[PDB]
Design a binder for this molecule. Structure first.
Ligand code: FE
Ligand code: FE
Ligand code: FE
Ligand code: FE
Ligand code: FE
Ligand code: FE
Ligand code: FE
Ligand code: FE
Ligand code: FE
Ligand code: FE
Ligand code: FE
Ligand code: FE
Ligand code: FE
Ligand code: FE
Ligand code: FE
Ligand code: MG
Ligand code: MG
Ligand code: MG
Ligand code: MG
Ligand code: MG
Ligand code: MG
Ligand code: MG
Ligand code: MG
Ligand code: MG
Ligand code: MG
Ligand code: MG
Ligand code: NA
Ligand code: NA
Ligand code: NA
Lengths: 175, 175, 175, 175, 180, 175, 180, 175, 175, 180, 175
């Protein structure tokens, strides 16, 4: 093999020694796994959402999945740039994720969104810790990328929170 | 000062004597104040809307706010073109507005929309009267601008009316 | 749960009874799993590719991954439309996939591309058989969707074949 | 009411307790009020600017106003996301603003721009302090959002500085 | 009549049966629109002159503005001429004809400073703006709501450019004696 | 039913009582029926046009049909906004139309275009009268919408007139 | 075999292992696609000729149409040639080869009137359309659904252009003896 | 006056002495006058064209007029750049033009186009002479500009020649 | 026949007598034949290119073919404009071409590109001679067109030269 | 002071009152940014050299990459220079000055093979990347969060291009001895 | 080394012998050095411009710098294409430039622009000489490229001349 899973070489081009690079990679690889499980669960909810609000939700969840995909790509490319091996196979990504993943049954949209919000929250807390890590290691490019991703993730988590809030235009009358 | 609040000079370039220009300015400045309070309340509702329909509403209210902003800009530039001084500070705009403005608490989305619909209705009635005024003064450019704005305002007010209507895809079952 | 994994309800809107739909869904879900494994492995190779041709390959592989992701989305949405439950979690996708997936080490580019070429071939052969199945059930929309995906998959597979062919501009002199 | 002005609930989605969120919200709402006063005063100057440079200034000021409006929208949405109530009505915005606002007369362009420059400086100094507050609370998304706005605000402030500098192409000969 | 070489004779107005506008009504509108057309094309040509020739400390901003103003005038002229033709008239066409039929004042061929140039343009705009207002009322009074609408759409663009010129001429500036 | 055909409720949002709205709706619904007949006949002529000029005419007629469809949409939406019920089914549209409609045979292009020209004229004359009705009721938005449509209708009608005029580049020599 | 100068010999077909298409199946498809390619490139070149040379009262509309039709034919040729290559064959390439392998009738180098020119094109389209229909059935019968799909996507574009030519030739016109 | 019609100052920026510049200016001004007469007559023909081919011609003539306008602008700007005064007023442009201009009657389209073809030919011949003049003076930018314009004018003239050619799809049968 | 292959009539619109036009036409037709052979061979190489660099080459060769097609179109249109008949059928174009064309076997990419380079060089030399011819006849539009085409052909020929140069990133190590 | 010909003297730093940045703080930031600017403009010019001169089997892909990399460097230089000026300093300007003030190693004027060329570029990137990291900490420590933000936005683009070069130099390839 | 600074090999692809190519290369390299000094000084003036007209100038100078950069790129690529070595390092470009470069102090804008005007004039004169050189060598692509660049440089030089002219809208009154 050209590279072995779990090894971190650092980078001469980026002037990152293997020691610092390994600490960053460890964090970024853990995030990658969670963000890809998030991407797949968002896809699931995008595909399956039904009912009175479904089309708006389908569009939102599709866009949220594309965001998660792009964050994943950034995390993975950074892992590779730092001389690591990004988690790749679906079985690896899920095994390495710490978040909870739905079983293969389809739940109602409130349950589904609440499950996703939990995932977001875990990723958000982790990402805040990892940005601090990167900045303390002097890896400002990593810290900056993590913040650029964090803002997009927090926006989506916030949207979910709002979808679940106890207000509606619907009245008893209209029923 | 270069110009004093409340004074109207007219315009030699536009061949509008100060007498006619003052009548138009008086109407346009009153509209400007109401339309900017409308813009700020729409922004408020855009920011705060929550629940099952929130994202569609957030997008609608954002777009409705941008429309109000553009109408305000047009009214203000016309005031200035006619040799007047458009109402400018936030405190002035609200003091000069005749419409009701919500206090700083956040109301549920039905209440919030109903409050906005009332504002629209007042602006719509006023704008119809002001277009007639402008045309009777021979200020056809003003009358035309007012109509171009009126159609956009009536479209948004109509959308609000529809959001509040007593129909829904939701059934008791789905609850 | 709202739907149980493996169940196929058909669709009243699409006038497809569950019996007929089930045959199509079993094919499309098998394809979905293989295509998402392909997507993840193309992403791996996109992230990790190095050497004299790497940027052209990085771009190709990224585009190929996007094509796979879009085909997956189409298959999953068709499953759902026919009253099925698309495979969703990463562990399910890999478990339900028939194709071979690389272990987590990184291999040289010729090895990597050859591995991908084998996955394409598997999917292309299956898709051919599934288009016939769909047309024999009278599900012309599914058969049409399969063909539109098949052509894009064959194009990428054919590109891989060309990348591995025994020609080059490079000479011993230039070495 | 659904939310009472001044209250800060935090956010479960964003994993920010109310205590922590409240510190951030008090800063962001203070900034919001100053930025919306800035927006309205830039609009004033956009509408009223006259003379030899007026079209270039009209365009600059209009773009600057759009930047302010976007920064305001970001601040307000962040307040709401953290479980706060963004200042909304014009009278509230001006009352909660710390910066100085022109009276309703129109001043010459150098005076007007100098007044705006002072508002920018106030906001820029506050935003610097608020980014540090956010980062010290571990609210990296807020701190990142503050910096993205800060750079655009500094750019406009710097433009104003250049407009007021003691150089020109004009000569006594050309007069 | 069947042997005339011309397809239409300048100054005649036939109305339109497609548009259900009789020739009597159409003739009143065409008289107005053709007069406007001549003035707008003189404006266009003078804006072009000023666009080409403007120099000095603000010249690039003015060059861009004047070019955009000329394009606007060209577009309004096109609309007026096409409306004359739609109503069964003959739009004034040759440059000599357009200037002969124009009521506005044209600069001679020497080049003047920018303040003079813009003030001369401002006077043209004003004359056109007053006439357009009159012609909009004429069209609405005859029930030709499409012409009235078209005139208003043009008027707002011409007023905006007239207003910009008024602003360029105003007595304010960033320049100070100390910068000089 | 939610609304009964022929009923006009007015609108609270738009501050139009039913009495006033009804006058406008009766005009707009009559126009709607004629414009949709026009749309269908332009489509017919678009589909069937043949000969030396057919492609230019096919494109013109298709664009003209799109214009008619947009005018119809505007009229129908205004009817609904004023609390009316827009004519909807094809049989209703043709029954409520005052203009003449071709039988199902295909006629030569001059005949076809002349038939369309007559429909345009009818609609143009009515629209002129309806804009006056709207303005006399103080419904300036409706009157403005009517004028914006009228100009596009007159443009297409005028094109037809030119297509039928007695000139051509063709000579006996070229024959 | 290891010492041949050519990388591939014209007329041989190797199939594809990437595409899981054996050479026997691939050869039947390639025979069909190459024949189509030759006819489509002759069509392309004749459409170009007519685009360049068209004159008279309708010439600009026809010039645009014929240019668009040629671009369509060029695109279909590209797809057919790339499919031949994907299936392990050698697409016909040189102009002499393309015309030699084409079954359709080509105009000689003189320029004919537009009605003649379009009628000659119409005959080419028709021949290609009938063959493409046959080849789509051939591909689907061999299980080469991607080739069949590609052929259908091409066929609809070629049919649309053939139909336009049929319309241009139809016996109607706005022109009247009185306009003449 | 800043500059007198007929003065040619040359340019220090462009390193063109007044003697060389004057030769170019006289040529360019001659061309400007002709090109603007061409513009006005193309407009005339665009406005008035009627009959079986009118829409295609209306479009072509509008585009040809656009091209003539852009050539005139380039000619005039170059005059000014070389320190001369471009011909400006409509009366001056027609007086200074050497080509024949139609009287104010409207002619049939064949006559109209033949008149335009003659103007084009005169301009084309002159432009070829002026390009040679420019190159002989070492004014390669002028020469290049003249050629860039020439190619566009030749293309339009060529189109007119083709419209007038003795071919058509029309048959006596169709008549 | 309307025109006989080999007749050159010149143009009254372009004020080009048949004697001058014929000299240009013969030159342009020669170039047209060569450029279309070049197009067909670039297509061939685009379709067939294989190996480590094939995708970059496939793209380059497709673009080079596009450029050759556009040059041929300009050449042919100019022939026609000058009153000649452009070479049209595939057999005629190859017969009239002076450059060498590959037989129908597929060669390796270095051989293929070297064959193309030779065609380019022949065309480039001819085009330079033809530009001088055109300018000497006073046909400046032809000369300008030829140069606009020449620069694009030279750029493509230059690229081929670079692809064939004796450098690479590949090392014996990588092999 | 009132009689100096220069408007600003190279090496002086005045801070900004608009930006509420005193001269002492601003001077530390400007020293850093100007040093970066010089290195980034040397990088830009060497990327341009390599873009122009690259040849061989991968040259077109590298030509495109190097052109894009140079545009990135140009953009970063622009941002650094404009920030120096905003903080009341004088950005290094002339080519001689930029290279004199640059700490990185510049190739001599001969042309080297692509592997050598890219390795020389890689060394420049690395030096700039290490300094930029230092300067981001400097800016944040002084409370100049906008400069820090700007530096990070630049750093990520420069790191991406440095990483691409690292990949181009890696010891893998599709090429095989059999293809040779 | 692959090529030595100062070697000129010509090109077999472009059919340009080293003797002819060397004459062009020397000319183009001279121009490249001057154009890059011009670029750097335009950048300088873009960065530093202050005062009443600064934003318009900042924009103009940025665009002029862009144009100079693109001309330099074309010059350098042509050098390389002809088998020479383009001047590359900043020190080499300034050493090889014949134009005067400002010292590192910042001058007022009139002085700055006058310095730039002088550089433009020197380049314009040289470029005219080089175009003639190229055409005399039969290198028509070089000649054409030089003219395409010349026209853009002349336009920018002309703008600078206009900015420096003795006119303004400013009056003593406004002061
Ligand atoms: Fe990626
Ligand atoms: Fe505005
Ligand atoms: Fe989807
Ligand atoms: Fe399709
Ligand atoms: Fe918002
Ligand atoms: Fe950012
Ligand atoms: Fe027009
Ligand atoms: Fe609609
Ligand atoms: Fe409008
Ligand atoms: Fe292709
Ligand atoms: Fe211009
Ligand atoms: Fe050009
Ligand atoms: Fe063409
Ligand atoms: Fe810049
Ligand atoms: Fe380049
Ligand atoms: Mg690596
Ligand atoms: Mg004013
Ligand atoms: Mg479902
Ligand atoms: Mg909330
Ligand atoms: Mg007519
Ligand atoms: Mg309703
Ligand atoms: Mg192959
Ligand atoms: Mg001048
Ligand atoms: Mg001809
Ligand atoms: Mg400064
Ligand atoms: Mg070389
Ligand atoms: Na390679
Ligand atoms: Na000024
Ligand atoms: Na015809």
């Amino acid at each position: 093999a050209r590279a072995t899973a779990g090894e971190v070489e650092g980078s001469d081009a980026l002037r990152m020694d293997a020691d610092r690079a390994e600490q960053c990679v460890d964090a970024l690889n853990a995030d990658l796994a969670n963000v890809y499980v998030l991407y797949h669960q968002l896809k699931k909810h995008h595909w399956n959402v039904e009912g009175a609000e479904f089309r708006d939700l389908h569009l939102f969840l599709g866009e949220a999945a594309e965001t998660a995909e792009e964050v994943a790509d950034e995390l993975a490319e950074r892992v590779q740039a730092l001389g690591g091996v990004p988690h790749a196979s679906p079985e690896t990504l899920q095994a390495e994720a710490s978040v909870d993943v739905e079983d293969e049954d389809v739940y109602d949209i409130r349950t589904s969104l609440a499950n996703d919000m939990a995932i977001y929250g875990d990723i958000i807390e982790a990402t805040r810790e990892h940005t601090e890590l990167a900045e303390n290691l002097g890896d400002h490019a990593t810290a900056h990328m993590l913040r650029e991703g964090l803002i997009e993730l927090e926006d989506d988590a916030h949207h979910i929170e709002h979808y679940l809030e106890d207000d509606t235009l619907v009245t008893q009358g209209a029923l």
